[PDB]
Amino acid sequence: NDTVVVGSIIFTEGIIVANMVAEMIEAHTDLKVVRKLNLGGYNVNFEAIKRGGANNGIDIYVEYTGHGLVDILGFPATTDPEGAYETVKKEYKRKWNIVWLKPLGFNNTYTLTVKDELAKQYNLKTFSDLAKISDKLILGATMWFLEGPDGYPGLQKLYNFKFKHTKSMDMGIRYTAIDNNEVQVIDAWATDGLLVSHKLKILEDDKAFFPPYYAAPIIRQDVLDKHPELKDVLNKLANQISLEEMQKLNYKVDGEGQDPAKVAKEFLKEKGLILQVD
């Protein structure tokens, strides 16, 4: 075949990075790229990569080390980033003939965030710092975070958080709530595109509750067999996206309403990862 299928679920960062992968393939090879950027949740991406692009699936997507380690493989979360990466790389190769390429450079871990003003008022840097004053505070959180021991239940047990109220707030309700001081803490991905524009600060998970969540492209071995050049092409992205860069791209989409495909391609051009005329 001469076509490769890049997938993403419906979420800003995923769509941006999947578009980057597609642009790199289109700029450095003659392969046709099908972008399947509307996959659902519940590990559909993973099921899709096991089918492959030739079987109504996908060939490549960007996965996070801790999700592969804990959710897909069922391994303990408390590990160092390199260990998590090497474990997922070895195990995905052995079990499914899927190849983890090099990390993009950022760790999009889940976190708790506060207004920068509150952080400076109480000198907050870590989750433990927040727990010490949590009895004065209200948490506004997404529904997924409040359900399941991997979210707030386990975090609260580990840190002894004592928030006065924990309010279920989906959509962008919790951002408005924290802006209005109706809540004082919200949950967020570390690369959330609204963190800077809302003057929010991410706190450190000092007890290491959350696993490393380093983004990396993963690809079927049989696609690399047909098109070995893809390895080096996609590894041109290695360590090219820092946390701050990713957050800025997410902001261009979520805060400024820009087209994620344009955001992705313009970032690549600005970094010299594709040519100005590509």
Side-chain angles (χ1 to χ4, degrees):
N1 200 313
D2 80 321
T3 298
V4 299
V5 183
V6 182
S8 184
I9 61 169
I10 304 171
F11 90 108
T12 291
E13 170 171 295
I15 294 169
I16 294 171
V17 299
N19 276 313
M20 291 184 189
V21 165
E23 293 294 335
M24 291 296 284
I25 300 168
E26 289 182 335
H28 303 293
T29 79
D30 289 325
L31 299 174
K32 307 213 170 188
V33 178
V34 173
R35 306 182 200 203
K36 204 166 187 184
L37 315 181
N38 63 345
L39 301 184
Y42 304 85
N43 299 336
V44 157
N45 42 11
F46 182 54
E47 291 307 316
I49 203 175
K50 287 180 293 183
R51 288 201 304 278
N55 292 82
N56 191 28
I58 68 184
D59 299 312
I60 301 163
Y61 73 98
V62 175
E63 187 55 284
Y64 302 81
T65 54
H67 176 66
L69 177 76
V70 180
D71 300 308
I72 301 301
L73 292 172
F75 290 16
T78 66
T79 326
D80 75 283
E82 186 198 3
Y85 176 85
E86 296 300 321
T87 294
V88 298
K89 188 167 167 64
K90 171 184 65 183
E91 292 296 309
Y92 274 61
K93 177 56 177 163
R94 182 186 61 97
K95 296 181 101 173
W96 302 294
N97 215 14
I98 293 166
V99 180
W100 281 73
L101 297 177
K102 290 175 179 173
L104 298 177
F106 62 92
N107 175 21
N108 190 15
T109 183
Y110 217 62
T111 200
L112 294 177
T113 72
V114 295
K115 285 282 178 177
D116 197 54
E117 292 292 322
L118 182 76
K120 290 177 178 175
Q121 177 177 249
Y122 287 105
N123 190 24
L124 301 178
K125 297 182 188 178
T126 70
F127 284 14
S128 290
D129 298 335
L130 186 64
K132 278 164 52 184
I133 64 163
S134 59
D135 66 340
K136 309 273 192 166
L137 302 182
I138 294 174
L139 170 69
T142 65
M143 195 176 58
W144 194 347
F145 184 59
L146 297 179
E147 300 175 348
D150 44 332
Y152 182 74
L155 194 69
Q156 182 193 29
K157 285 196 269 69
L158 177 63
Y159 281 94
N160 195 24
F161 282 116
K162 288 179 286 198
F163 291 116
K164 300 162 61 62
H165 303 299
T166 66
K167 294 199 161 67
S168 182
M169 295 181 164
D170 285 311
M171 321 168 65
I173 292 179
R174 78 196 189 283
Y175 304 105
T176 304
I178 191 162
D179 282 357
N180 288 334
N181 198 28
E182 296 169 353
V183 310
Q184 294 76 43
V185 186
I186 70 170
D187 59 323
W189 290 105
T191 62
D192 187 317
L194 301 185
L195 293 177
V196 177
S197 57
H198 287 259
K199 247 291 183 175
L200 298 174
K201 178 184 178 62
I202 294 168
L203 300 175
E204 172 187 348
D205 178 14
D206 54 288
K207 298 192 179 198
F209 177 82
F210 293 112
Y213 246 60
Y214 286 75
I218 75 174
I219 183 170
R220 292 176 59 88
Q221 178 67 56
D222 64 359
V223 171
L224 284 180
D225 291 339
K226 294 177 180 65
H227 317 291
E229 69 277 13
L230 284 174
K231 180 187 169 187
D232 288 356
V233 166
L234 296 165
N235 275 338
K236 289 179 171 193
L237 297 175
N239 200 46
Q240 292 291 327
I241 312 178
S242 71
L243 192 77
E244 175 187 318
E245 290 176 311
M246 191 67 249
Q247 196 284 331
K248 278 187 170 57
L249 302 177
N250 290 333
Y251 168 71
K252 291 179 184 286
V253 175
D254 285 350
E256 304 183 314
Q258 296 185 34
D259 189 335
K262 294 175 68 75
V263 171
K265 194 172 181 183
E266 285 182 358
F267 174 84
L268 296 176
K269 283 192 181 194
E270 292 179 7
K271 304 270 295 201
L273 294 165
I274 65 180
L275 300 189
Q276 297 289 5
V277 297
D278 277 327

